[PDB]
């Protein structure tokens, strides 16, 4: 019981080089683009969207 979760024994483990590197993963940002585009307030909703919407909303 104590020292366990998901019916499995838990223990601390020293993180390796790959884990330490993946943990700090960053991605260079992309320049702006929203301001330079045709933006409009949706006048209607697609068919596949209504179902999806009403299905999980």
């Amino acid at each position: 019981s104590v020292g366990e979760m998901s019916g499995r024994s838990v223990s601390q483990q020293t993180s390796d080089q790959y884990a330490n590197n993946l943990a700090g993963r960053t991605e260079s940002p992309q320049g702006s683009s929203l301001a330079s585009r045709i933006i409009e307030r949706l006048s209607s909703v697609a068919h596949s969207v209504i179902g999806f919407i009403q299905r999980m909303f």
């Binding site: 993963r25 991605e27 683009s33 585009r37 933006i39 307030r41 949706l42 697609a46 299905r55």
Partner: protein, 117 residues
């Protein structure tokens, strides 16, 4: 911020006419992508769109788009099994929004959609 105030501010930044009534699910059209904004679950602002995927892309290539970065607004590529459609989405807490949060989120979502082309 309440959902209604966030949306209203967003529309104003986008120079969009403010709806007489702000529905629970808002739809905005940016270029070719019809985006949808809503509060789900409670306290979270969810945005999503249905992109067009490339056949050539294998599972590894498609999954590569979902790796985490330093930007929590980076969108997640998924699939809606029931409807048979791919779904690209991002999400952030309503309680930590500032004036530019929803605009940034929408920008990140669309940029994510465009990349998938």
């Amino acid at each position: 911020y309440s959902f209604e105030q966030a949306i209203t501010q967003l529309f104003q930044q986008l120079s969009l006419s403010i709806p007489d009534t702000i529905e629970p699910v808002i739809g905005v059209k940016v270029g070719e992508f019809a985006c949808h904004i809503t509060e789900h679950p409670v306290g979270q602002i969810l945005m999503f769109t249905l992109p067009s995927l490339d056949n050539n892309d294998e599972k590894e290539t498609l999954l590569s788009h979902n790796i985490f970065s330093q930007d929590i607004l980076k969108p997640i590529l998924s699939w809606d099994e029931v409807g048979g459609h791919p779904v690209l989405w991002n999400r952030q807490p309503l309680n930590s929004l500032d004036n530019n949060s929803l605009y940034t989120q929408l920008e990140m979502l669309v940029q994510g959609a465009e990349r998938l082309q």
